[PDB]
Structure formats: C-alpha cells, structure tokens
Structure 1
Amino acid sequence: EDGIFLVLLGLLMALVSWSMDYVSAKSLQAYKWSYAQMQPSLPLQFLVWVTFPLVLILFSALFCHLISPQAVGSGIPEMKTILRGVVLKEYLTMKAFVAKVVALTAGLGSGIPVGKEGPFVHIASICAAVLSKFMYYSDILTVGCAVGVGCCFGTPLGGVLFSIEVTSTYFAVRNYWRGFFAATFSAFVFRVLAVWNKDAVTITALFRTNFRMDFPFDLKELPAFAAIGICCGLLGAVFVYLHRQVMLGVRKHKALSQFLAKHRLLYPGIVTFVIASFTFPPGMGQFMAGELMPREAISTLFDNNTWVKHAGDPESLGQSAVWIHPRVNVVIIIFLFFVMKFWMSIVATTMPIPCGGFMPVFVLGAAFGRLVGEIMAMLFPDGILFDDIIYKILPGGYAVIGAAALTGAVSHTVSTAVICFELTGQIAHILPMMVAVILANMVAQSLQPSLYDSIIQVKKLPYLP
C-alpha cells in the first residue's frame, strides 16, 4: 500500500506547490502593474505601494484567525515536538491545511518577507497524516518533511537530509528510502509542470545561475569564503537572539501586551505598513533596491556581473541595474539592503500569519555574500592569468556561499548547503559552501540555540528533552 500512499502524497504536494507559485506570481504582476500605472503622481504611487500589501497581510492574518489559529507560524516547532513523542493532535487536521494554504498564498503575493519552505513542511505533514487516516507519526511526519521541502522548490536531497536533522536520537533507515522516493517523485512533477506551463523549456534548477565552471575561484580567495562562514555564524546568532527578544517583548511587556491582546490585527497592520513605507522606491527604496521582490533579490544577487565595474551604462545589467544608484557606490546600496532587510525580516516572522525564516535569511545571506565579493573586486582588479586569458573575481559565488552559511547558522543545519546548490543548478562551489556552513554552525551553536529551539522554548511547547 506504500506505493499508493507515497505516490499520492508526492503528487498532491507537487500540485499544491505549483498552484501556489502560479497564484503568487499573478499577485506580484498585478502589484507592479498597478504601481506603474500611477507613475506620474507620487501620492498614488504611495497608495498602491502600501495598500496592496496591507490588504494581503490582513487577509492572511484574518483568514487564519477564522479557520484555524494553529496555522500561524512555521509549523516546524510543533512538528519537532510531535516527533519527540508528544502528539499535538490539533496541528494535523484538515482545518489547518486549508487555513495554511490559503493564507500563505496571500502572504507570499504581498512582497513582505514571508518564507515558503517552513509552511510546506507543515502542509506536507498534514497531507501525509490525512491520507494515512483516510486509507505512527514518526514515519508519517518524516516522509512528510522530505516531500514538503522537495516539492517546495524542486530540491530532493535537501528534503531527505532535512528529514534526518529534524529527528531526535535515532532515524529509521526505512524512512530514508520512503522519503527519498517520494521527494524525488514530487520534485520531478513540480518541474515538469513548469515546462508544461511555458516557464522553463526543460527541467531546470529553480534559480539557475551562470558562473564560469572554469577556474571559478583561486585558492587565494578561500580566506574570504572562510570569513563569510564565521561572520554568518555571528550574524545568525544575532538574528536568533533578536527574534527571541521581539517575541518576548510583545507577549510580556507590561502595557504593550494589554493593548495588542484586545485589538487583534493591529500588529499585522502596523508591521506591514512600516515595511512598505520604507521600501517605497521614491523614498528609501532607491537606496535599498526596494523595487525587488524576494525572488528578484535572489536572481540579481546571484548574478555573474561585477557591479562595482559596470560603469558607463547601467542598463547593460538588465534587471540588476536596480542596484546601481547614480550617486551611491553599489557597496553602500548592498549594505543598506542587508541592514534594513535584517530587521524587517525579524519582525515580519513574528506576525500572526503563515510564515518562515528560511527564505528571508537566505536573501540576507546572499546580500552579505555580495558585499564581501564586490569589495574584493575592488582590491584585486587585475585578475589571474591562466591558459593565456585573464580570470577575475566573480562575486556571485560569494552570494551563493553567504546564503548557505547564514541559513545554516540560523537553523543549525548543514542541509542548507544542499538546498542552496540544488536551487542554483551549479556545483562549482560545493566544497567552500560546505566548509563555510560548517564554520557557521560551529560558531552559531556556541552562542545561541537554533531558531526553532528558541521558538519551542518561548512558546513553552511540551518538548521532551
């Protein structure tokens, strides 16, 4: 019967993931078009920029309130609690499935720092439970997690490895085989649908990069990759620390908690309003590449161009031209993007909506990575002679490493190295990604608990040692 269960779980999740991306994309196109149509008047540009995401976030928060409060958050803290032996039954119901899928879709389409992966671990877990009931949570949820990550982005190995790291002491080998099968199948279907819908041509990586694959880096820049690893460790520790402090403040502050406890939806309202206010292009958005939606932030941060060099005509960068302000060195623009998004990301992940920190952190990591890359590009401008031609620093490589390393530091995982290279489609940098991730973890684990463990402690979940 496993053949039926595993195929249907895999297939149905491929369809949920694909449909969600389809709709999310349409929301963002509607947003950009609507904004563009107001081009001659700043008050209307502001109105659109801000109200479009207020509507979607308030809808998301409200929908969960009305259908299933258990849909709020990333799921993973509760799934871990269940894997440890305490069955929080209320998080594996069809009501949560509906609330989660609907509200998440609305959230993603807003442009607000809301991840997708976290929620998919939960969505797949529920599906696995429901199919099983229709037709032993340690095995249901383990397969679920692998499928969730797999179908979320089209990243099979990422999923399987994740399903191991989320366990307690012992992992059953039988789940390795079941998870691997289902996650691979699901990912395959997901990418084929993209081709069918004229958005891929062949089966490809989700955020495919275009690095040289020929002398991709020298040994002389390995110290930079190592430095990114260590720095990501520290940044990750800070991210988690501050996240905790925000959650506790909102819940415990003597007066704030009285107010927000009654007037629900103020918190979503205000958080969203402020993030939108700062990102408006004519205001600070021009200094933060604020026109970029999460996927475009990734697409441009993993570019193969060297922004500090592309003078004369910035339009030659295509979409990446958004980073080249007429009066500000691109290094500063990257710095400001990182800093501003850092706190926006922390706060956004505390809103009462479906959300997660994987993709927010991934982007912050990429930004940090280019900051390092673009700076070295100004220090070693001459390049290296090999086989009669000159090879130069390729900052996109640093972005890829930074994304993996910071994610690692925040979650306490090494699976992120794999998810990241499956997303880019190129493995020129495997060994330095893996080393940077290990270093990031050694540092982060010595300072602060995983993001998920901080949440488990804060929410006082019945997590057995």
Structure 2
Amino acid sequence: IPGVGTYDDFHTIDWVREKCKDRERHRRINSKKKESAWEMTKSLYDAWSGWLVVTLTGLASGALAGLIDIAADWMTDLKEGICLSALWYNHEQCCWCPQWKTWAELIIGQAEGPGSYIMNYIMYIFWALSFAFLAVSLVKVFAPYACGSGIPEIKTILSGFIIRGYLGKWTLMIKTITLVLAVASGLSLGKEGPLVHVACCCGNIFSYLFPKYSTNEAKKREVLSAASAAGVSVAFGAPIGGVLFSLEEVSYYFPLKTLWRSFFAALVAAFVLRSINPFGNSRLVLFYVEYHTPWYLFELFPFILLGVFGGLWGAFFIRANIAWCRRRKSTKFGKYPVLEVIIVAAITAVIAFPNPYTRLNTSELIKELFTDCGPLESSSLCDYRPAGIGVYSAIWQLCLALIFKIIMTVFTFGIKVPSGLFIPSMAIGAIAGRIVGIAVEQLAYYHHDWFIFKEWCEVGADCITPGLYAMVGAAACLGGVTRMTVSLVVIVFELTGGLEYIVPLMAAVMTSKWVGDAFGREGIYEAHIRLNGYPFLDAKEEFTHTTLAADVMRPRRNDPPLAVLTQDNMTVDDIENMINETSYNGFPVIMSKESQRLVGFALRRDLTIAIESARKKQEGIVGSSRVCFAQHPRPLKLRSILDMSPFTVTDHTPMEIVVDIFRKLGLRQCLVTHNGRLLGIITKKDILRHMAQTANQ
C-alpha cells in the first residue's frame, strides 16, 4: 500500500524494519537483474549508487568550503578598508601598499592621526553591525534551522531522529550565506564546525537522487556519516581526522563499508580543496609550519599543566554557556534574537578594535600564535626574540585577549546565527600555550644553570618552542570542551603536520578529558542536546539502576488498560476510532480478548494509510466491512502493515538488558509479556524518560 512504512516529523526510525526493507529491495533487484540485461545494468547502477553519492557529497563539500573561505576572507578584509586598484582582491592579496586604502583615507582623507583612528573605529563597528544584522535577518526570515553549529542536531539525527527540513536546500543556502556573514562580522565564532552541517545537507540532497538512499532511512544515515567525515576533512584538511570524528562523535551506527566510503569522500573533498590551492584553502589548511627542534621530556610538565587549563576552562564553559542558553529559553531574552545579536556584535567590535590581537581575525591569530619566531619576523609576539621590558607588555596584550575570548564566546554560542565553537576554543588554548611557552623560555634563558635546562637545553639554543606550547594548549582546550581524544589528536596532527609531536598532544588532551570529567562527564554537544530536549539514548551513559521491565511498562495499575486490536473481530470504523482516540505510535494486535496472546504489532500511521487506501480503492469499505489481520462483505485485510515478530522481554527482565537491546538493535518498542500473554509496551521515549528520572534531571 502506498505510504505504508513512512515516518512523521520528530520521530525515531526502527533500524530493523529499515534494514529488512533494504534487503527485500536488494533481493527484488537481484531477481530483476537475473531477469534481463537492462535490469543487470540497473543493478550495476544501484551497486555504484553509494560510491556516486559519496563522491558527489565530497565534491560539493570541498567546493562549498572553498567558496565560503574565499568569501569570508574578502568580507573580513573589507572591514578595515578596500583595494581601489582591484576591489575583488583582499588586503593580503592586494598588497602582495598604495593600492589598499583605509576608510580614513577614503572619508577623511588622512591616513594617520586621531581622526583616522576614530574613522577606522567607527567604520569597523558599522561593518560588524551590518554583517551581524544581515546574518540574523537572513536566518530568521528564510531558514531558522541554519542557526548554531548543527553538530548536536546531526548527532541526534544519526541516532535515528527525524528533523524534516534541517538538511534541506533552503537551510544549506541560508547557512552558507550567513556563516560567511557572521564570520566577517567578527563575532566569537568559527566556520569549521558548521561545515559539517553543510556537508550533511549536501549528502541528503544527493541521496535524493538514488532510490536506495532515498527510500531507506539507515542508508541515508550512512550517507550522512560519510558527509560528516567529509565536512570535518574540509574544515581541517584531515581526512583521517574526519573519519575518526565520524566514527567516535556523530555516528551512532557505523558499518565497516561506511568507514571506507567516508574515507573516500573525505579524500575526494581534500583533493578538491587541493586543486584550487591556495584560492579556497584557509590558513589552517595551509598552516604548514616547520619545526625547529624536537620536544624534550621535561617539557611534558608544562604541557600537562596546559591540559589542566584545557580541562578547567571547558568545564566552566559547559557550566556557563548552557546556563545562559537556558536563560534565553526561559526569559524574554529569547523574544529579541535580532537585538541580542546586534548588541553582542556591537560589544565585541568595540572591545576588540583597540587590542590588535582581538581586532585580528581568529584564524589569522591562531596561525600567528602557532607560527614560531624567526629572524625575519618582527612581530610584537617575537620582538624580543635577550629579552626586554616589552615582553611583559606583550604578555599583557595576550592576557587581556584571552579574557576577552573567554567571555564573548559564552554569550556568542547560542545566538540565532551560524556559530562554531572549534575556532574560539583553539584560539583560547593557543593564547594560553603561547603565554606558557614564553614563560618557560624566559625561565630557561635566565635560569639555564638548573640541571634540567643544562642537560636538555644549551646556552643560546632554541630548546623551548612556544608554537608547540600554543598547539598543545589549543588541543587541550578543544579536548576539554568537546571531550574528544583520538579524533581530536589526529585532526590536530594532520592540521599541523607535527608527526613528532603526537605524544605531547595526546597527553595534554587526556589530562583535559580527566579534569573536565571530574566536573561532569557530558560534553558541550551532549549538554546542548539535553538542553534542547531531543530524544537521545546516548551509549556513553551507563544505566546502573536495578529496575525490571515491569517498572517501565506504561499500562500500570493507575493507568488504563492498553489498547489492543483483535485479529478478525474488528471493523474499519472501530479501528479508525481507536486510532483517533489513542496516542500510541502503534498498537499490539492480539489473537483474542480472552487469550490475549500476541499476534503482531500494527503502526498507527500504516494502519490509517492502509484503511484510507482500501476505502479509496475498493467498494464496500465504509466501516461495516470487517478488518481481518489473519492470513488468507469484502472485509478489509491489513496483514501487510503488521509485524509478525515484535521484540518481547519478560516482566522480570532487568532494565539494563532492555536498554542494551534498544541501543544495539535500535528498536522502537518492546512488548513486555509473561506466560505468553501481552502485558505492556516499553518504548524508547519511556526508556529515555526513566533514564532522566534516574539521573535526577
């Protein structure tokens, strides 16, 4: 019957049923292939559909990432001036500087002086405000789903949740435009994490072109996992890192074939980015900073210390941001998203313009911090490198920036614009690591008499490398705020290329994960999932409460008896009334009202669809005709919509085993029986609600 087997919005899919549908389609297609040669070519196309869709998703993700990077760089450069000779060229490419003219030279006509500084300040603020206004208005008017990182929603979707329109074309376009707008605005956010959502949108749009991936939910989830891998790859140019992230972060179920498919998609996207090098390649992709000297054993001490910082700040953020977000979801603050975005952008621009580090783009700041001092470098971060008073000043200039980055982010992650949390955390950790490395280098230079320095360092030698400390701090902050261990480390290593610095990174990361784990085992993405109330049966959480299945059945003593359907003692009108009277997703069809022996399970959606189709197709089905759910007045027959083998457990079964079954098999509901007689039903909603109750939420 047409329509049978579909799902509604904000519903969970049944993986077993979807896979049964997929293999039934596979058997039918194989039979057709053996039937004819044209069907054989169709079967070959069906087999190659997965490769085709993953390749298309990778190519689209790479192209979109390149375009977004180019547009964001140009728009960010527009704030501080423009290149009259070539308006399309950005500041860096325009000066590759008489061609570049600042707003002071174009309005006041003076390149220097207090008036020039004032004009530049006002123009910077105005451009930031305009970009923020455009981004928020576009998000609110066209695609409200384009707001946020999207990683929490993608995680919920890959678990089996349905969010219609989240991965649509409208959301893709609006997010693509608004991410560039927000990045140019200068808000404390990034465009690396959100790229995963863009890749997922592309994956869905391409999956619509293949019947195998367009009529089955599980195959769509596999394509989405590959898309997420490709998105991370384009974000950080780390295809292996992207595959690991898909494996450990967003993919609830990851078949082995999906591993290689996601790896191929990530490699294709990385190759697409390489082809347009350096046009669409970001600074992070082109980082490629060489190392001066190898790390040393004693240096692991400050690194671990950095880890502690990464463990602490992230925890604080998880406690702060969430709380603020909750206030936005409870008070009137959420009724004025445009005003909130405008105010945040104004404050950020005003407080960031005076300080060169904050006025600097976050990605460029990260690149500079990771970049090591050189003989040709004369930046304030490397003016001293003996050392002078300016060092202290430099440290001061860093410290303030750090504080700024810590504050704005808390009020920036959650606003109604595309915002990413990877870049801000990386910048904060990089600043902290740079400060720590500067301190360690100064101590080594002024106290080389210590046996540790005298053994592992030499007078007038590059024993200490602050760039490595900044990298370690960035990795520690990312791990402490996301609780990622392997994917994070591999992504950092691929981004920086420091194969010899994998050990220094890992350690720090682990430390952060432990420290944060002391203040809470939940990460930022999971915390946001819980805040939004999405149905998520996280496997990381362990159910320790000693309860039995009898304690979770909905039809309790106080509750009314569960609605059931007789095999062949029901009519179409009665079934319609039952559907319109009960709120159950499905109903268990029993043999008889006395025996109450389970016969099957019929979903309400399929039941209604079958009834309507039969009424519109045949004559005499006006309610008088009976409905028979058994096998072979024109009585209605609805055996095709019922499940012959619903999962069942005993009333005394410990709830831990039930949760295990639900997690591993991805079931939708389980019929709790005893003596072969139906008693109750435990649904994923009930399991989640019980888990929340036992967790004191």
> Is 1:210 the equivalent of 2:285?
no
Distance 2:532 2:54 in 1: 33
> Is 1:372 the equivalent of 2:372?
no
Q: Report Cα offsets for 1:434-457 as digits up to 9, x if no partner.
A: 111112112212323211011111
Distance 2:70 2:518 in 1: 41
2:362 to 273, 284, 294: 294
Alpha-carbon deviation of 1:426?
2.3
Segments of structure 2 that go 5 or more residues without pairing to the other structure are 1-48, 83-100, 105-111, 211-217, 539-697
1:125 to 183, 187, 200: 200
> Is 1:154–1:188's contact at 8 Å kept on the other side of the alignment?
no
Distance 2:303 2:416 in 1: 37
> Is 1:335 the equivalent of 2:399?
yes
SS at match of 1:241: helix
Alpha-carbon deviation of 1:113?
1.8
Distance 1:453 1:392 in 2: 41
Aligned equivalent of 1:27: 75
> Is 1:114–1:348's contact at 8 Å kept on the other side of the alignment?
yes
Aligned equivalent of 2:504: 432
Aligned equivalent of 1:235: 313
> Is 1:364–1:403's contact at 8 Å kept on the other side of the alignment?
yes
> Is 1:36 the equivalent of 2:107?
no
1:279-428 to 2 correspondences below 5 Å: 279-281=352-354, 285=355, 289-305=357-373, 316-318=377-379, 320=381, 328-381=392-445, 382=448, 390-414=461-485, 415-428=487-500
> Is 1:384–1:392's contact at 8 Å kept on the other side of the alignment?
no
Amino acid at match of 1:370: R
Aligned equivalent of 1:13: 61
Aligned equivalent of 1:61: 136
SS at match of 1:124: helix
The more displaced of 147-156 and 323-332 is 323-332
> Is 1:154–1:191's contact at 8 Å kept on the other side of the alignment?
no
SS at match of 2:415: coil
Distance 1:6 1:332 in 2: 48
TM-score (normalizing by structure 2): 0.60
Alpha-carbon deviation of 1:305?
2.1
Alpha-carbon deviation of 1:388?
8.6
> Is 1:205–1:422's contact at 8 Å kept on the other side of the alignment?
no
Q: Report Cα offsets for 1:134-169 as digits up to 9, x if no partner.
A: 232320211111011112232211110110112466
The more displaced of 452-461 and 323-332 is 323-332
> Is 1:153–1:206's contact at 8 Å kept on the other side of the alignment?
no
Q: Report Cα offsets for 1:397-425 as digits up to 9, x if no partner.
A: 11011111110110111212122222222
> Is 1:110 the equivalent of 2:185?
yes
Aligned equivalent of 1:221: 299
> Is 1:81–1:464's contact at 8 Å kept on the other side of the alignment?
no
> Is 1:88 the equivalent of 2:173?
no
SS at match of 1:417: helix
* Residues 182, 205 of structure 1: alpha-carbon distance in 2 compared, 3 angstrom cutoff: same
Amino acid at match of 1:462: P
Q: Which has the higher helix share?
A: 1
Alpha-carbon deviation of 1:218?
1.7
* Residues 29, 321 of structure 1: alpha-carbon distance in 2 compared, 3 angstrom cutoff: farther
* Residues 106, 322 of structure 1: alpha-carbon distance in 2 compared, 3 angstrom cutoff: farther
Alpha-carbon deviation of 1:319?
7.5
Segments of structure 1 that go 5 or more residues without pairing to the other structure are none
Deviant stretches of 4+, over 6 Å: 321-325, 385-389
SS at match of 1:103: helix
> Is 1:369–1:400's contact at 8 Å kept on the other side of the alignment?
yes
Aligned equivalent of 2:595: none
Amino acid at match of 1:273: A
Alpha-carbon deviation of 1:326?
5.5
* Residues 346, 27 of structure 1: alpha-carbon distance in 2 compared, 3 angstrom cutoff: same
SS at match of 1:73: coil
Distance 1:199 1:158 in 2: 17
Alpha-carbon deviation of 1:337?
1.3
> Is 2:147–2:418's contact at 8 Å kept on the other side of the alignment?
yes
SS at match of 2:465: coil
Q: Report Cα offsets for 1:230-272 as digits up to 9, x if no partner.
A: 221111111111111111122224xx43xx51x4410001000
Distance 2:423 2:52 in 1: 32
> Is 2:438–2:466's contact at 8 Å kept on the other side of the alignment?
yes
Distance 1:319 1:128 in 2: 45
1:261-272 to 2 correspondences below 5 Å: 261=335, 263-272=336-345
Alpha-carbon deviation of 1:14?
0.8
Larger CA Rg, structure 1 vs 2: 2
Amino acid at match of 2:223: I
* Residues 223, 85 of structure 1: alpha-carbon distance in 2 compared, 3 angstrom cutoff: same
Alpha-carbon deviation of 1:393?
1.0
Distance 2:382 2:103 in 1: 21
Q: Report Cα offsets for 1:311-332 as digits up to 9, x if no partner.
A: xxxx942484699995953222
Amino acid at match of 1:301: L
* Residues 321, 168 of structure 1: alpha-carbon distance in 2 compared, 3 angstrom cutoff: closer
Distance 1:387 1:245 in 2: 46
Distance 1:36 1:63 in 2: 29
* Residues 325, 356 of structure 1: alpha-carbon distance in 2 compared, 3 angstrom cutoff: farther
SS at match of 1:91: coil
Aligned length: 443
Distance 2:346 2:59 in 1: 38
TM-score (normalizing by structure 1): 0.89
SS at match of 1:86: coil
Aligned equivalent of 2:271: 188
Alpha-carbon deviation of 1:462?
2.1
Distance 1:319 1:372 in 2: 17
1:277 to 339, 350, 358: 350
Q: CA RMSD in A?
A: 2.6
Q: Report Cα offsets for 1:41-90 as digits up to 9, x if no partner.
A: 14312211211111111111110111110111111111111111111122
Distance 2:192 2:246 in 1: 13
Calculate percent identity across the aligned residue pairs.
29
Distance 1:327 1:371 in 2: 10
SS at match of 2:378: helix
> Is 1:453 the equivalent of 2:526?
yes
Distance 1:62 1:204 in 2: 29
Alpha-carbon deviation of 1:296?
1.6
The more displaced of 65-74 and 323-332 is 323-332
SS at match of 1:13: helix
Distance 1:164 1:436 in 2: 22
Distance 1:70 1:24 in 2: 21
> Is 1:85–1:464's contact at 8 Å kept on the other side of the alignment?
no
Alpha-carbon deviation of 1:205?
4.5
